[PDB]
Write a protein that binds this ligand. Sequence first.
Ligand code: HEM
Ligand SMILES: *P(=O)(O)OCC(C)(C)[C@H](O)C(=O)NCCC(=O)NCCSC(=O)CCCCCCCCCCCCC
Ligand SMILES: [Cl-]
Lengths: 380, 78
Amino acid sequence: SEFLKNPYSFYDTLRAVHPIYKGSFLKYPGWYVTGYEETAAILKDARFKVRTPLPESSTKYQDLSHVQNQMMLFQNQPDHRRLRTLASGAFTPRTTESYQPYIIETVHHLLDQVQGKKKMEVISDFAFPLASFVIANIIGVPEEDREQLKEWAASLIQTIDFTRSRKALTEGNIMAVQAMAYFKELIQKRKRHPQQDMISMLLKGKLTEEEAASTCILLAIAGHETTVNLISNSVLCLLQHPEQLLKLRENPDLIGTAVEECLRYESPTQMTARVASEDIDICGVTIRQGEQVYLLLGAANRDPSIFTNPDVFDITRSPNPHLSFGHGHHVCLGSSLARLEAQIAINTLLQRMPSLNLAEWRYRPLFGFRALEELPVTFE
Amino acid sequence: SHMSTIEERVKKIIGEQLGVKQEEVTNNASFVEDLGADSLDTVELVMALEEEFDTEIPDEEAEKITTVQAAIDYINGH
Ligand code: HEM
Ligand SMILES: *P(=O)(O)OCC(C)(C)[C@H](O)C(=O)NCCC(=O)NCCSC(=O)CCCCCCCCCCCCC
Ligand SMILES: [Cl-]
């Protein structure tokens, strides 16, 4: 709870000892990295491999493991490049720009439903519905099934986090069965009758039908969790700094640089991980083969050797080489989509709700993500 | 019959977690070497013990324990 309110003081005490810190947290021993240059170096180095978030040969949660281990996020060469390239078509600059009409339309539709209420909960009323409708439309999930998708995403995201439990993993296995079965059926439908969606793109091409399913699940999860946190974290940031909120309101063209600073200051993803595939010397320490490396992206974004006054929120920072989307080969596939969703949501919100105000914010019990439980606001 | 002792409660947790038969869960047996606990099993074992005996086991103390008897010793001393 004390860590959730302000994790950056905890990151600072680690950084003061060493930017690569040998320790153990929540029963997980390894190297915890808070330094920017150390984080960037590790992510860029292919000798630090991604790995399965549960033990490779574990069959305690057989279905959960099988779904997890097929995802590009946890695959190395050469399987990673194959999987990523096949999914990349839906997330190119040009394709992402073509989503703008639907995003803008969805944003206005959601703001319409609360416009006369003088109150809203940013997450459940705005942030989540937008991100959910968008990703489901891209993948090709009909509106009738999008509530099931929300359930699977929320359950499966927990299964990779430090805070996971036996009951979370047991639940995750059930949701893995449901999600895999569902997408298998949807793929069979699209195989007979292709539509204008990502699933049909995957069938054009190679890629097994299970791999296509697990790809859909990965993208559904990322679309439902992180993007929602980006929007909600940003709104809170701006409202806590009225000086720059007013600045942004006066010129919406600053939304680009503003969203980048929100990404740096309250990073939706606080952690990713690697395993050392061999002995590696970095920053004066030796990481032995098989040892685990935990990269604290939020902490690296507060490195004073890169960002002069790191704990100051400043939307005018240029450039802003934050590590919120990671770095290297696994760098976020959907970063352009996330940025667009956030830019349109925040600008339109500030435009339509000119007197926006905050209504003791609690964060979800996740250590690898920075996610608000809710964000009530008042306006007009 | 009798109420479950510290030893019996510990051994039951180990047996249920590792799917291993009792009396194969002997004292002096190693979790990793003998009972075949992997890098999740050992985490889930500590969680299950923490809940069973309503206690917090520091990461430092968990690292010291590698055998069944040692786990029983820790719970008796705390
Ligand atoms: C709907 C929008 C999003 C989609 C579709 C998406 C999708 C993905 C995918 C498929 C990957 C794996 C790429 C690979 O392994 O080659 C990935 C990686 C990653 N994503 Fe995103 N993502 C989205 C939003 C976000 C947001 C908002 C953040 C937080 C700022 C984020 C943070 C990351 C990070 C840090 C990685 C790299 C993880 C690692 O290297 O281990 N993503 N994303
Ligand atoms: P053994 O010696 O067999 O155990 C090794 C393992 C890997 C199990 C570790 O000891 C371990 O259990 N570690 C704790 C769990 C862990 O490392 N989790 C990974 C932390 S985060 C991560 O690796 C990347 C996730 C962040 C990227 C966000 C992308 C958008 C969200 C999508 C989530 C999709 C998940 C289904
Ligand atoms: Cl301010």
